[PDB]
């Protein structure tokens, strides 16, 4: 059964231009820019246009939807073919993905360390040696099976590091020390093993198929949107741009039912909030990562 489709009651522009922003709690300067408002409004507009087609039966599978997200995102790249390739390619199971917790991701270090669910662990390094890391281990549950996801790690004997890093540099070379920190920074996110992504992807068509019901209440819809957001963002299916695509898709399904979600709150980067939480936590906290204030 067909669906309403995007609303005609649109968010005020000031809010369009914040759809898919990355409103870092430590630099919402980039949220305010002319280009980033331009980027966001475009995402706003292409979400609804995907919105239009979910309503009509056009987009049959979450993978098709994710394509639309990817097509959109690529047309915003003014970068070139190494970078184009990345935003357009799924992560393959023969690689790992890693985000070092340098700028602009510094706000995250604190989020891991004061996180109730964090462990204290020992991380054994070939260059620095042994390290105390606060470790958050995101895990989903699916069919009743446990799927590790992203693993945050923050190194905590900081003094020893700055000393040891400076030490290590001059021998191997920054060249050879950079090498190491691109992949093995004491502070880093290690993302979902690309191997889990087939079953996650199957799971997402399942959710997608469910959420393009007609019979669902407002509550159970938003739940299913938060989830789809939650899984897609946390799987990080692509080499780059996953956060942008997750939000786009989560929103396109909303608009297909005639919902108009607002921007996310400031300091609430959607894919990080998702990554740093479990599923039901995020589903319930969802409506308030959103700027729902008149």
């Amino acid at each position: 059964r067909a669906l309403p489709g995007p609303s005609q009651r649109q968010l005020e522009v000031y809010d369009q231009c914040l759809i898919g922003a990355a409103r870092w709690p430590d630099d919402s300067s980039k949220s305010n820019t002319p280009e980033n408002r331009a980027y966001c409004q475009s995402m706003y507009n292409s979400i609804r246009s995907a919105g239009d087609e979910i309503s009509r039966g056009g987009i049959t599978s979450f993978e098709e939807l994710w394509g639309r997200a990817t097509e959109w995102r690529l047309s915003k790249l003014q970068r070139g073919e190494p970078l184009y390739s990345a935003f357009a390619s799924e992560r393959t199971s023969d690689t790992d993905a890693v985000t070092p917790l340098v700028k602009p991701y510094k706000s995250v270090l604190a989020r891991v360390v004061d996180h109730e669910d964090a462990h204290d662990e020992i991380m054994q390094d070939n260059l620095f040696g042994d390290l105390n890391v606060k470790v958050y281990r995101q895990t989903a549950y699916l069919h009743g099976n446990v799927i590790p996801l992203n693993t945050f790690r923050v190194a905590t004997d900081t003094e020893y590091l700055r000393d040891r890093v400076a030490h290590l540099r001059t021998e191997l070379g920054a060249k050879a020390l950079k090498q190491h920190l691109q992949r093995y920074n004491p502070d880093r996110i290690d993302h979902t093993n690309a191997s889990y992504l087939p079953i996650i992807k199957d799971h997402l068509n399942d959710l997608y198929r469910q959420a393009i019901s007609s019979d669902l209440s407002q509550a159970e819809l938003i739940s299913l949107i938060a989830r789809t957001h939650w899984w897609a963002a946390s799987a990080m299916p692509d080499q780059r741009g996953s956060a942008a695509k997750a939000e786009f898709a989560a929103r396109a399904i909303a608009s297909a039912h005639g919902i108009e979600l607002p921007p996310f709150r400031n300091g609430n980067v959607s894919d990080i909030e998702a990554m740093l939480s479990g599923e039901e936590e995020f589903v319930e906290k969802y409506r308030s990562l959103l700027d729902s204030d008149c």
Partner: peptide, 25 residues
């Protein structure tokens, strides 16, 4: 002791802050 992470000050070898992909070992 330094802020978390701030042991990585002015290091020319500071990683870049975006997702990198590597071959599995």
């Amino acid at each position: 002791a330094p802020k978390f992470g701030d042991w990585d000050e002015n290091n020319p070898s500071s990683a870049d802050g975006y997702t990198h992909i590597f071959n599995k070992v």
